[PDB]
Structure formats: structure tokens, C-alpha cells
Amino acid sequence: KSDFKFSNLLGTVYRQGNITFSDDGKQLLSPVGNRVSVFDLINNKSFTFEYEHRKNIAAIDLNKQGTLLISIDEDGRAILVNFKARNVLHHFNFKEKCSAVKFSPDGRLFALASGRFLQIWKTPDVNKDRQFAPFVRHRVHAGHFQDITSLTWSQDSRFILTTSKDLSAKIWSVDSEEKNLAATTFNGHRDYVMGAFFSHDQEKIYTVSKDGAVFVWEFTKRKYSWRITKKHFFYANQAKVKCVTFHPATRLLAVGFTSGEFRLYDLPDFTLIQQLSMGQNPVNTVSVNQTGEWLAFGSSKLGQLLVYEWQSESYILKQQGHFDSTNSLAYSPDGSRVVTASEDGKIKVWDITSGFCLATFEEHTSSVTAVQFAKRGQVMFSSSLDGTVRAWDLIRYRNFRTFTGTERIQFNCLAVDPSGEVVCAGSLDNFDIHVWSVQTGQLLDALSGHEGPVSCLSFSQENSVLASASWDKTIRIWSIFGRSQQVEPIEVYSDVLALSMRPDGKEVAVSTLKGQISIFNIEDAKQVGNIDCRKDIISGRFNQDRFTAKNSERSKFFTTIHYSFDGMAIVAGGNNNSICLYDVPNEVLLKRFIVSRNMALNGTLEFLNSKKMTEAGSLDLIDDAGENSDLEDRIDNSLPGSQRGGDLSTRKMRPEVRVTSVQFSPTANAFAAASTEGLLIYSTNDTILFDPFDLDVDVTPHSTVEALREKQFLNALVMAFRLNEEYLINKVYEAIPIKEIPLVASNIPAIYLPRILKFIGDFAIESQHIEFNLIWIKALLSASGGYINEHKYLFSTAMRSIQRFIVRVAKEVVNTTTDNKYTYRFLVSTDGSM
């Protein structure tokens, strides 16, 4: 139950740093803020590493065995991770801002550009145990005078070619005996040298600078001493070079500028292969595949990530995330994708497994405040600050309905009917609730009676009663349908934000500004029970404020709560960096999750380092923005009293950490939280955590495979259920023959029914045994499908996971074979003559 682990981070495909591919370039590793996301682009899936830097990460590299990663943040705290085990091996603090880190091609050394020193360390093994100090320093070279901007290893891991802000580039041999082969420095650029690469044969050296010159250096005579043989210029006038890379085997130089334009050249002849634009923001990262066929570009201002094949002029993916600006989320009615309503005015539909956005919708001209699904994933409603609720067909991708009021107000929350005739929406400046029909477009009613801004709306999913709750300390229950026009006001102790509604519509849980979650019986309007949550809330201290995190009143309450689908738990989040989940019978905290440890966000640390507090102000409120290398980030265009507007440049404070929406998954035992870093997805998995169910001493994996070998199949299945071990359940499940699936499925005891149903769901989504899984589903639904119907909310997430398998792989296969049957019948039954 309560044993959730950080699974995934939807949204935010790129934040800051360098993109890396794999060696067999199937996955790409993308630095999201202080996590690292890895997107597998062929097996369409994605994961995020569990570990967490304390600042935004700035460098990524993993060796070409694929076996370990090293990630450095923006003040040099490196973290070495085992890439296959997904566990962190070492934490190593380099003392200053490291610009690049690279492994050797032969994997055994890595080097990094810390300040103006190139330091080469040698890679610890993945097979060795963790030591106190696994890194053994090879050398540290200091020949540059200003900071080093780039590394490049040679093809043999023998020389390393580094580029600096100082207007040179240098070549260093790895070992001391070849010191005479590599002692030269490469002058001649007017600006920062952005890259320096070898050719395939390591005879030519290309050095690309910030102003736009690429120099070809050759070991020629005018003795032989590395002349410059040709200077080529990009002649991009206002823009200048932001990122350079070179695939030496295909002779492909890829260059991204500060204007979104990137050009890619065939280098020693300098012929423009292609030139096209990501956008208007600068291209912060270019990275290239090992075969040189894919180019991954990252722009850091809009958080966007392309990977683009330049032969077939086509985007493998062109994605863009949302940092800090995400107002709402909603799971699809099968938990396959999450719809995100974001403050720059748009809807984005993110697949969960493959961590990418499928569709985006921009018809709101202001910050979209709420999304909500209806008509079982066919329609989706959203309300924004531009005055409109509007409806979206997720088949034809059309905004087919737009609902406005008559009073020019901005809508902050909505609620749809189950039987989606009526949409409903509430504002924070109008005190009314606006009731629109969906079939016609008209304003059906304006419900009145709150004396405070209607903070939250929800329709009961079963008996269809409306529950609104507002800042006049009052939850209110409206019987709209059928001649009633009945209003029942329940008062409560303080002003309400985030009501939520049970899946059976019996009870309603409200979150209050005191810090509590009260739970009320709807039909008999009396309080069933409350949780007191303001003392298990992690409220950090901001940098600007002059009052401690203990005495602060900023975030000791939950602005979003949500029921579990068995009705037994509540997940909750707010403007604090803890999300908490409880079980509502016992009103006790099951688990509390720290949503960020990034010190680049504001409300993370409860106690701020007193070294940073000086005789006039803290040292993190000092703006060091004019110490910057160029005008576009020396610029301050932040109009003064702006909080929660748009365009993070226009607010002047650090982005605070907050969760704006929490939701449970409708199909598989997880929840998504819309934080500022992205859509944090926390999920359990049954592979770990031995948690048996009434086993005795004679219940053993050995006993289960003896019962399987002796072919008591029902006894082996219930022994594996009492073990609750996923591999054993899978082994017995596949070993039962087709001849006696229905005998076993009829003799399964009723306590092991949700276990076998949720196992069949989470197995059959990705397993290939489609007819076996459908035989088991048919046998279970036929043998025990009355117990399910009279215990709906137990199998409410195990049955939604099963019809996530039938309509999403099995029905697609059945559609293909049906079309083949009918095209056969046409192609042989009719007349093709001339």
C-alpha cells in the first residue's frame, strides 16, 4: 500500500546541461533540473533517476560501455551513478564550476574542466565494491589562463584537446612519454573558443569560436609546426555560436547559435549541409549519435529538446516542457496519459511510459487553471483566467465548445457531470457558480449562496450532487437535478481550499487553511472525521524572508487533496515541499514525500546556511547578473511586484517549490504531483518489499514449485499469493495449462481476487501472451464476476487496468486482423480486369 517510490518525472524534457546519447544510441540522457531523465526512443519508454543533486546539474557523461554515469552540478558536486543498477556509487565534490566532463573512448579515464584546470581522473570499476575514495587522480594540467569551455578526447584515448575563454586551445597527451607530441597551443580567435575537435585521422584540428570562425589547423610547413590553413566564417551577424559539436567519422560539424538557428556543415570543405531553426531562444546544447545520424538539440529557456535526423529531414522528437508553470493535471480514465494545464496558456497530453507529449492545445489566451476528463476519455474540459471554460474532443483534437459567463470573470476551478450534460465552474472573484449545459452551449444557471470566492468544485460520481467549497469557511451541497434546487450548507472552522469527493459519492474531504483535512458525510451533513496535518508539513525557509520556517504561515496547509480509488487514502500537497498521504479510517500519516532537495528552488531548506548571511543582507539576494558574459542575461526586465505572472525572467525571485495538483492513478497504484520541477510520478512496485499474506512455515518458494511440479495448480497459485512474490506468481501463472484455467479461476478464494486481477493487469499491458491473458480474464470474469460487481471499489483499479489491456493492445490487434479479412474478401471477390 503505502510503499511508494519515485518512479518518473513527466514534463520538462530538458532544463540545463548537455544531452548525451547512449553508445548504441537508443536512449538519450537529458538533464532535467537536478534529476536526470533517460528516454528510450526505440523501446518506447522512459525513466528518471531517483537520486537528486542539490543544485541544477550542468554536466553529464556516461562511458561507452553504458555501465556508469557521472553528473556534475553547477558548483561542482559530482555524483557517480551505476547506470544499470540505478544506484549512486560516489559523491565527489570538485571545488568549482565544472564546464564539461567526458569519459575516454576506452572508458578507463575521465577528464573535466574545473575552472582553468583540466583534470583527468581514472574511472573506478563497476564490478568493484564501493570504497571510501574510489577515484584515483591521474593528473591536473594548468596551462589556460581563463576558464576552460570544452573538452574533446581523441579517437584513441591518447590526447585531449581543450578550449578556453582565454582565446586559445591546447592539446595535452594523457601520458608523460608523449608530452612532446602534444605541447602546442592554438591562438588566433577573436572570442571564446567554443570547440576544438580532431579529424578522423587525427591530423587536422578544427577550432570553432564564439564570434563565428572555424579554423583548420594542419601539421604542415609554411619545419613542420601546426599552421592554420583555412579560416571559415559563419557570417551570422547578430547571433553568435552557443554550442558546437563534431562527428569526426561523417565529417559533420553541428553548430547552434543564440538565435535558435542551427547550421550543420561538412567541415573540411565547409559546405552548408543544412540550416534551420529550433525557435527564437538560443540553442544551449548540441549532441550527436555515435553513428552520427541523430542530433539532439536543447534550448534551455523554453525547456525544449529536439532530436533530429539530418539525412531524412525530419524530427524524431520535438518536445518542450514547462518549468514552474503548471496549474493542474488530470489522469486519463485509463492511467496511460496525464493532461497538464499550464500557466503559459496551454494543454499538454503526456504519455506516462514514454515520457513525451502527444498533443498540445493552445486556444486559451491566459493561464489554464483546471483540466478534467469526461465521457470516459473522449472529452476534456479546461478553464482559464481569460474568462472561458472550453471543451476538447480528444479524437478529432478540436475545441468544439466554449462557455463564457455574462460578467467577465476569470475561472479558477471546474467540475463536470458524470453523465456529461453539464459543466460547472467557479471563480475567485464572483461568489457564484456557473452552470452550463454541454449539449447546447447556454448558461443553464448561476448558483448563488456563497459569501466568499468559490475555491473548489466537484460532482459526486455516483448520485450526481454538486459540492462546492469556498473561502467563507463553508462547504455547500447542491442538489441540481430534478425539481429540487436544494442547498445544504455545512460550515467548517476556517476557509476551504481543495474539496475532494469519494468515489462512491458518500463523503467529501475538504482541506482547510487551519491545516486540517475534514471528512463529512454528504447525505447526513455531519463530520465523519478529520486529520490534523499542519505538523507533518515541511515548510522551508525562503531566502528573502526574515522569519523562521517554524513561525511561518506560508505553507502549513494543503491546497490540493485527492482520494484514492478504493476510497481509503488521501494524497495531499500544497505550497510546501512535502506531499503527504493518509488513510482516512485511522486518520494517520502513511507517508510523507520530500518533493525537492534542489537548493536552487526557494522553499526547500528549513535552515539556511548562516555563512551566507552577511553584515548587509544574505549573499543569495545579491544579484550577480552583471557579471555575465553577454547582454541577454545581463538584462533585467523583471517588473517589480510580480508574483505568479508568466515568463520566469519577470519575477526576480527564486522559483519557490510547490505542488499545485495531486491525483491518484485510476489503474495502477501511483500518484502524480504537479510540482515546479515537473509531474512527479510516485509508484509502488511489487518486485521488491517482501510483504506476505498469511503464510505459514510450510509456505515457501520451494514448496510452491513442488506443488507446481506435482501439478496441484490451485495450491501452487494460492501459495504464490501467500508469498506475494511477483516472480513466483508469474511462474505459476504461466505454468497452469489452458485445459484447467476455469477450474482454478473458479476455485480462487475471494481474498486473492484483487491480487490476481491487478497482477493480470500489470502483466498483460506489456506481456506478449495475449490469448493466455484473455483466457484468464474471461475465466475470472465468468467465474467470479458477481463478487466484483458487488464489491466495485475494491476492484475499481484492477478492472480499469484490465480494460486498459483489452482496448489498447488487444483491440488494436483485432482491428488489424479484421481489416485484413475484409481486404482479402474484396481483393478476391471482385472484378479487376483492365
Binding site: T291, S312, S314
Partner: protein
């Protein structure tokens, strides 16, 4: 050890005027010795004492077949390049307009199939030679055989669009 490549008397004068750009990669990049028999109208390639004779033979044989100078240098370099020859043979009806169907008005169909399949084609009277990679030759030859054996222009042009995309695509 030597090779003889007979230059026909319709590709003789371009060989003589572009000869000064043909023999330098034959005599210093390739280390062959090269003679041009004005009596037999042939090119002789002999090996000196100080497996490239077949490369030089294919170089001058491409020029003999009808491919231009830079195309022949592309065959001389670029190890993954091949060249396939075939007559039509599949007369007013069939011979005199199947080749007009390969060409089109101003050779635009031949230009389109060249750019789509990343080969390049020289079309004689009924002798089609194709210079490209192995898969590229396969697709250009399948489309040429298609529009001498009868296919709609919409079908062959849609196949040309599709083959350009899928030949440039990774995965």
C-alpha cells in the same frame, strides 16, 4: 598485368578533352601506367612494379559507359559505389516509347528517379546504366523496370517519394 577498355566512337572526343583530368588520379593516386591506343580506340592500363587495376578499369569504364567526369571520380573513390548495366528488351510500340517513358518531357522522370533514389542514370537508346549504392541501384532499377513494364505515373511517383524517405531514414 593490364586491362583494355574500348572507347566507342560516340564518347571519344569528351575523353580527349577531359583526358587531362582523367589520367592524374590514374597515374599518381592510383600508381598505374596508362596508354591510349589511337589505333584500336582503346585505353590500356598496365601495372608497374612500383588491387587497383580493377578500380582504374571501372573508372575509365564508367567514363566509357557514359557517366561524366565527376561521376567517374566518384566511382574511383567511394568504395561503396556500384554500377549496373541492362538493356530494355522486355520497334514503334515497345522500344520506341518505353524509353520515352523513362525519360519524360525534358528528362524530368529520369531526373526525379535519380534524385529520389540517390543514384544517377545514363539512358542510351535502350541501354540503361545506373551508378549508386547497392540498395539505391535496387530501388532505381525496380522503378525503371516498373515504368518500362507499365505502371501509372502516380504509382511510380508515390513510390519515388516513399523510397527517398525510407532510404534516408535511420530505422
Amino acid at each position: 598485368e593490364s586491362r583494355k577498355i574500348m572507347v566507342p566512337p560516340h564518347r571519344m572526343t569528351p575523353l580527349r578533352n577531359s583526358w587531362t583530368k582523367i589520367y592524374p588520379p590514374l597515374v599518381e593516386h592510383l600508381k598505374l601506367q596508362v596508354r591510349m591506343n589511337l589505333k584500336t580506340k582503346s585505353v590500356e592500363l598496365r601495372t608497374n612494379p612500383k588491387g587497383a587495376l580493377q578500380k582504374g578499369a571501372d573508372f575509365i569504364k564508367a567514363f566509357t559507359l557514359g557517366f561524366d567526369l565527376d561521376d567517374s571520380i566518384a566511382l574511383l573513390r567511394l568504395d561503396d559505389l556500384y554500377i549496373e548495366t541492362f538493356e530494355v528488351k522486355d520497334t514503334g510500340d515497345h522500344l520506341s516509347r518505353a524509353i520515352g517513358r523513362i525519360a519524360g518531357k525534358d528528362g524530368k522522370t529520369k531526373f526525379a528517379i535519380e534524385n529520389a533514389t540517390r543514384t544517377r542514370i545514363v539512358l542510351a537508346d535502350s541501354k540503361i546504366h545506373i551508378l549508386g549504392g547497392f540498395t539505391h541501384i535496387r530501388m532505381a532499377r525496380e522503378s525503371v523496370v516498373s515504368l518500362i513494364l507499365g505502371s501509372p505515373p502516380g504509382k511510380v511517383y508515390g513510390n519515388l517519394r516513399t523510397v527517398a524517405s525510407r532510404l534516408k531514414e535511420r530505422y
